[model samples]
Target chain A: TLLTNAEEISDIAFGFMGSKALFAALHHGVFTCLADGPLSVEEMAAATGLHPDRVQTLLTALASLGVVSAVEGRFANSPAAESFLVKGAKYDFGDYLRLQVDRQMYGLLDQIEDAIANNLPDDATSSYADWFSDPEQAKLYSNSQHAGSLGPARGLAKLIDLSGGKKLLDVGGGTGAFAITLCKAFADLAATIVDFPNVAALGKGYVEKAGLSDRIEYVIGDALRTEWPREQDAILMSYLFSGVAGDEHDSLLKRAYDHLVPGGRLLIHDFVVTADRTGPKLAALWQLQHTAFTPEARSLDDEWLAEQLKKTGFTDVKVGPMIPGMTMLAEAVRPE
Target chain B: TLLTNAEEISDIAFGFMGSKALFAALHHGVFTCLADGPLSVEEMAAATGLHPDRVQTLLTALASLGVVSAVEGRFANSPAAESFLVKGAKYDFGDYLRLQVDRQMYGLLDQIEDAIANNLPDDATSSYADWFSDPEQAKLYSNSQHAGSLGPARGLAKLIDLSGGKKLLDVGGGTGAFAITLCKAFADLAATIVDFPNVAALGKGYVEKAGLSDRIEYVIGDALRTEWPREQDAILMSYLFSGVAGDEHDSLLKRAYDHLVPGGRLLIHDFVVTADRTGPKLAALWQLQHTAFTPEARSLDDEWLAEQLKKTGFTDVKVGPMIPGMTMLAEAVRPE
Candidate 1:
């Protein structure tokens, strides 16, 4: 059934509340505090260093949102929160949200109207340029982005079979999230990650942390300008196109095609708009993030990507759903 | 089906995009422009005073969100947009969202972490306090709130049986949205809206504009301190409890009981947290809005309100959904 008028309006208007509550809860360690068992408001307050009354109010609010549940006057994480919210959990994506998305990108939304009205990006001083220019910010950006990308990286690995691919190239891969993930999934796979110098340093740290330093190498330069290592058994581009202009897709696909070995696969994983251009809502929103940071940011169509792959002389082109509606993986192979 | 990891994360992180896109589209009159017929990018740009290139990009992005649709290289409003987004439509809730919720409330989301930590409101200035201090701002606030409240007001009027009631005291009613809506629904019903002087002034203008001056009276004083009309057949309080303190519900309900005639109903329309408190999401988020504005702002529970009514000597207390998950209407009657 369709949403009621209240549901429909509030869903859009109050979404930030759901987002910020999760962020605030994470910041205050509510999920972590309740990881073992349900906690009374007093207990939670003492553990998280919040006022007891505030704890009660916050937990009650969270309970109303299904992030936490109140049972017998005690609060505990919901099943979903227990899995993804607790720190050090295999799929913990909270930090990525808390730091990068909620803290960094949340404010950019206010500028979207200005961004469109003036055809300008969000305040230049605080945009992506600053993150790349400042080492500490860059490190935080890389690490947080790695945390967020881990789940999608694992998902992509499961979707793409890399068993026959010994050598892989990860184009525009930040912090080696995808490369390391793929290497762990495929025993024979070794990968090269291409990114900027600052990002490459951070990726190296992550690769070492993953104990894949020897397997996943970093090529320190821009993906567009750098000479990619040739004859790759497979090539992957994750979240690249949405940051570039519409005209850049064709050239990027051609470059990937030229670098791939005969019969090698090319995988383009990113936010792809629907055929009708009606949302896979997430991808469409993500396009605004691109608009906020880069003038060229645009969500490309999946069919368009598949067609581009075919036009670039790759055969067996296939577009598969990676994240159902939000993202897709377009795979093509060079003719044997 | 459950959302994929990317989809789930993006839904939370990139939600602002969907919000701002709709906001910008409304501000730029895209839906209104497309109301008559399909328009090319050039046509839309000229009509809306936007650059042609920017118009194409904006329309394409909106099309991806299903806010608008593209057919044969021209753009038109989607079925959903045509109904709810077009200017002059009865259900045009876009101005409500654009002005009241998106423009006024969206920026507060960024301060949620700080609000929780410092136990302070979103900002020291420019919150609810300023609206009452500045007449122009109060007018804007009243008008926008009326826009936002119109849908729920209609929904509430539909749910309640006001056939036996002749008078309504709309306590804390801004712009008389609920009172005016209900008065229209029940022609025999007249209303006295109680609010601050500034807000009541704007509300009078709205009442006059709606040709409701004969049916609705404005009480230019605080509902908390002002003398209410005696023996009203019914009383309605919409969105009041959440902006007040937890300790205040008793007095508010008691006052309602005192003024209500024998068997006269008391109707409260506001955000109600679920019994389990696991969410209806929107109410939970709206609670945060309360937190951001006032130190005393708190979401009331239905059971708690029912108990308060019972304590205050009201009988036949009942709670029913008003906006499905986002809001509820609590009804009780003063016993004979």
Candidate 2:
């Protein structure tokens, strides 16, 4: 009534179906079955062990969401479905969606209000990484995080010139994704990654697979708690500040500042809620998603980050978006 | 990487948060709180019984989604939010959303793959309305269905000329919504609704409240097996066909045909998947959504309905959109 407007509200009100269809198709290997070419619902059912009727409905839902297409009675993956949803596809992004967003983060939403209110049980407050003690989950989490972060790492590489950089510290670097991407960006730079034991343990293999074994090395400890290898030319804390308590931001920035040599570049990449503290949907959702485990998590804005950076004796604090609406890359320096 | 479009894929991948945010905010009455005007996060938190921090994250997510707007540290509902989402707003659409989609249908998504496959327990295959054994659920379902159907009923009135109609038969009409709405359009018409005992039990009160008890009455029997009153001038099957098995279509049409006097007009309104059987998102989704309980539920296309109607010897059949991608309206007649 407010607008012809059934379309808009209906789209959002119907949003649960979009994600569920995506998950169902992904879970049933719909994309993989269609990867070689289009498949009729019968073929999909055979491949996925679902009934043909089920596949038909599922495919129809996916087609509506633009994740798949159908013609001549068979369905094919959309470019994004092939690129991101297919297993062993270019990005392995499906696993990232399945493992992290679907399994871990999305469940947080089932108790979303409880999460934001910190009314969840005591153990929910533990570090999110703690659950990865099961190697299966840990590796899946690491692999997916690696695939998911690679794009952002490439974006970070785009924003800053690292030609002069020699030593790089990647704080809380999971699976060495940031380290590997940055090492490739600046060939001469050797990267050191600090993270939990399990995640860092997965990093060596990923780094080696990236053929950056000589350029990237791992330090198995918490970036906030562990000793940083000092005197780095560049210190990168990607997606770190947004999860920790706001009070911890200054001390963390000061620590990053102390670890850097004079004139060292420090880049902080993470979600920064806009000035009004409303949205940029992706940024806000990401900030909210972290509360599943880090109930104390807060969304720091670029303004707050710049202030924190300056207060911690960093200079030339420039903050701009790296992934528009999703994340911002704040670049500052420890001045000579 | 395929499109420089982190935006597109990320949006779909991140969609669970959108609906969850919606359900959470609606659950806590955030929109209801702001109906008077904008309020700070602290004020919203206090009113909503959520922490200010939780309110910030939720409101931020909402703002990103354009469901609400934030300015001067105060958040206000978008017109749609105020219109459809507020507790006591013009439409009780929020309850339709909160109770049905969020509570009942959305749970089916947890086992979405299983639902489509009918791999769920045998009990899950029972009628969805069977859950209304609890009076609370029965009343809530009726009230919400009434609110949800009011718009579609209005749309139906616009598409047809019912001025000459004197008697109306509503198959499986819960809460007398369509009957009441249609009767209002053709004031001389008396309406009859046939539904399960519990649902019909609630319809009397709603009809009484609408002050149409004299004009509207209930049969309190199954639409298919229970007898429709003989020789009606008009017959309505809104949202009826989509839920029952497809094989039952012809017999039901025959029953309606046999029961109608010559020149009686029968209107069939329900989701009809496009000819391609791929899109019209809302239609596809509604068809898909119902499979959660009735896994046998298949989306019938417009072509199929028209064909079935003609096979039953109906004349001057016409089918067109009533709710635009949500439900199609088909009108046919038993010739004199």
Candidate 3:
């Protein structure tokens, strides 16, 4: 089986082809144009302003990937592409996915070995400090994070019970996606999202656009350094710990413990590795991404996280799946 | 089912992560260093000359992908990596795979969309004419192609019944991989490999190195333009048609037909698509690669190829698996 699966290994070995195909199609607005209706190769070329011959081959490749479909010599979006890739669709994360393939993940992956060899990030341009210093880049980063976080936010809202909770603090909530989704799910809930000034500014727009500005407010400052708003019923830290150093986690938990009322819930949502850390595959890959870019980005094991919470003076700690294997939500209670 | 399989789609979508990890480990010679024995992080860092911090993370990522294994803070090659990734093992393909990930496939894949849209090849630098013109690059190309072809060469030798076949013309057989493997597999089989002058020059050394000079020889000229050696018992065109213009297939097949003696077999080995051209996803991806790099690279489906053979005046055509879904072996016979 080891030697015989060479073909299969080679298939996965060239998996970047699949990523690049999807990214390139999204880059050129292939799905957006097809959203209008099926178009002939010539029609698509004219609409996309690309050459007909080139468009034909690209479309065929995309069709082969099931990202697009060809019917009677005309091309249209497959239902999946239509829903997730079409520009301006409510759940559309195309821009974010494009950012990942084009700017963030795929391009830097080539340097991953060097990153490990040198103990350096994949690319000089892909750091939090670098993006935060440039407003335009920060906006792009914040918005893409928002787009990516939407589905998981919805999932988290459905999983957690916030019916009796009236106040929530969203720590380092990049674009307030988690807070907004929870506020909508629980009408009586009012939440504050604490993040960097530039990121908070972008999340403000999203919160206002969702018509939940009254229920969700932004605290424009570093979550780690910011003064706590006391007696919060629940604190949501989604994707925050993975971006910070391992040493910073216990202190952050301590702050959450200090800020929460007795019986309050603290939720830590992010990619978490298995106990042995061999893999859930996705989390391991994510850890590599962190190791490539962040100084100390790591997927804390669920047990490690639960223990951290308990050590920070919390009880009844539990870890539950949010996106199955990809992510988890860890909760602990401040005993009454 | 389409919507429900998001996780499966995501696995393929992020398949690049798996590829980059393997490529990175191979690039750093991690497997080669571990070939002799298991190594601790510091020991690996010293062996690979990478920073210990960087090497540790890379090794962990490799371990997560099952390419390496970890035991008591030391890392060793997994069975698969041990066999194929160590530099000088019998089936070691690390060089070829490195060429693919580092130089050939990944870099060009990003241009796949434009290559499709403009009907343009991905890289102006990857042309056969260009490679054939540069002696150094031609050597690199020929050797990498040989490394890649080894497995398939072995596979083809096992699949095709060449017991009675005495003489073969290996059309465009870079580095004589197929010829050497076939000659080794069949005691009476002798082969003449037809390829570019530069490639053939390099292949000659490989044939000599294999101690196959008595059975296999090189014809150093373009297979398309060269005069055929008459009365061959078999002709093998491995991955040849897929690299050339779609329009050139008929002429090439005609040449084979003219050169074959009565009842001689003509074998076409290449990536063949489905009847609908929808996919065997790997071939579809390969087609994109061809479209990116060759002016007329396209996957020839089995039905269309069988039809081509019939039209070219061959009889009793048969199509069978070479590597199952990734490639096929198409066989036809000259009338007795």
Question: Of the candidates shown, which would achieve the greatest DockQ relative to the real structure?
Answer: 2
Q: Judged by lDDT relative to the true structure, which candidate is superior, 2 or 3?
A: 2
Point out the worst 10-residue segment of candidate 2 chain B by lDDT. Answer: B1-10
Query: lDDT per residue, candidate 3, B266-306, as tens digits?
Result: 99988777666566667766766766666555557788898
Model 2 chain A poorest 10 in a row by lDDT: A1-10
- Shift of residue A75 alpha carbon in model 3, Å: 9.2
What is the CA-based DockQ of model 1? 0.33
Which model scores highest in TM-score? 2
TM-score of 2: 0.85
- Write down the lDDT that model 3 would get: 0.76
Q: What would the per-residue lDDT of candidate 2 be over residues B239-328, giving only the tens digit for each residue?
A: 887777655777999989988889998989888887677678888887777776666666677887899899998999988887866888
Candidate 1's fnat? 0.41
In the order shown, the candidates' Cα RMSDs to the true structure are 4.5, 4.1, 4.8
Q: Model 3, residue B271: displacement in angstroms?
A: 1.1
Candidate 2 wrongly placed segments (more than 4 Å): A1-4, A36-52, A70-75, A121-140, A154-169, A180-233, A276-279, B1-6, B71-74, B121-140, B157-167, B183-192, B196-233
Give DockQ for candidates 1 onward, in order. 0.33, 0.38, 0.30
The local distance difference test score of each candidate is: 0.76, 0.78, 0.76
The candidate that achieves the highest lDDT relative to the unseen native structure = 2
